[PDB]
C-alpha cells in the first residue's frame, strides 16, 4: 500500500516510518493526530527533532538533516517526515 | 484576505510572512514552488533554517523555535511557515 515518492533515508528507517504511519492510521482519523503520533515515535526512536505533515493535498519546501527525510503515500494520504533541529 | 489561525511570532514578522506569501502567489501556481519562494525569503531575511508547507488539505505536528511559527490561509491555500534548525 505504501508508495515512497522521494527519500533520503536508510531503507530500514524507511520501513520503520511506514510501519509507524500504518499504526498511526489504525489508531487516528484526523491529520494533526496522525502526524503527532508519527513525529513523537521518531524523536523517541531516532532522537529529535522531527516534523511530520499529513494530508491529502499539500506541497512543501523544507531543509532536513542529510539521510533523514521521507515523503510517501499511504493510500490517499501523503506523509512527509523529516528531521531538522 | 489573510486569516491568521495560529501563530507564535511577532506581529511584524507575521505581516512579513503574509506579504511574502502574497508575492509568492502573484508569481507561483504550484504549491511546492510557492513554499520554496517563501522559505528562501525567510532564510534570507531572518536566517536559516525555515520550512514551509503550502496546501489545500493537510495537517501537521512540528517543533519550532519559540517566537518563529505561523499558520494561516491566503487565497485558497493554507501556509505553514516555521523555523527549526
Amino acid at each position: 500500500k505504501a508508495v515512497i515518492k522521494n527519500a533520503d533515508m536508510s531503507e530500514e528507517m524507511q520501513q520503520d516510518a511506514v510501519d509507524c504511519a500504518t499504526q498511526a492510521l489504525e489508531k487516528y482519523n484526523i491529520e494533526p493526530d496522525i502526524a503527532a503520533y508519527i513525529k513523537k515515535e521518531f524523536d523517541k526512536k531516532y532522537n529529535p527533532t522531527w516534523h511530520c505533515i499529513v494530508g491529502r493535498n499539500f506541497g512543501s519546501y523544507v531543509t532536513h538533516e542529510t539521510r533523514h527525510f521521507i515523503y510517501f503515500y499511504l493510500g490517499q494520504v501523503a506523509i512527509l517526515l523529516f528531521k531538522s533541529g | 484576505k489573510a486569516v491568521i489561525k495560529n501563530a507564535d511570532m511577532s506581529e511584524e514578522m507575521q505581516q512579513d510572512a503574509v506579504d511574502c506569501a502574497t508575492q509568492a502567489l502573484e508569481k507561483y501556481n504550484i504549491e511546492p514552488d510557492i513554499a520554496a519562494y517563501i522559505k528562501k525569503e525567510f532564510d534570507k531575511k531572518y536566517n536559516p533554517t525555515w520550512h514551509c508547507i503550502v496546501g489545500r488539505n493537510f495537517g501537521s505536528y512540528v517543533t519550532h523555535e519559540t517566537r518563529h511559527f505561523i499558520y494561516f490561509y491566503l487565497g485558497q491555500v493554507a501556509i505553514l511557515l516555521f523555523k527549526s534548525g
Binding site: 523544507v62 532536513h64 542529510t66 539521510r67 501523503a78 | 511546492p32 513554499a35 534548525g85
Partner: peptide, 9 residues
C-alpha cells in the same frame, strides 16, 4: 549535514 528538498502532491 543538510539538504533542501521540495515535495509535490
Amino acid at each position: 549535514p543538510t539538504r533542501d528538498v521540495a515535495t509535490s502532491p
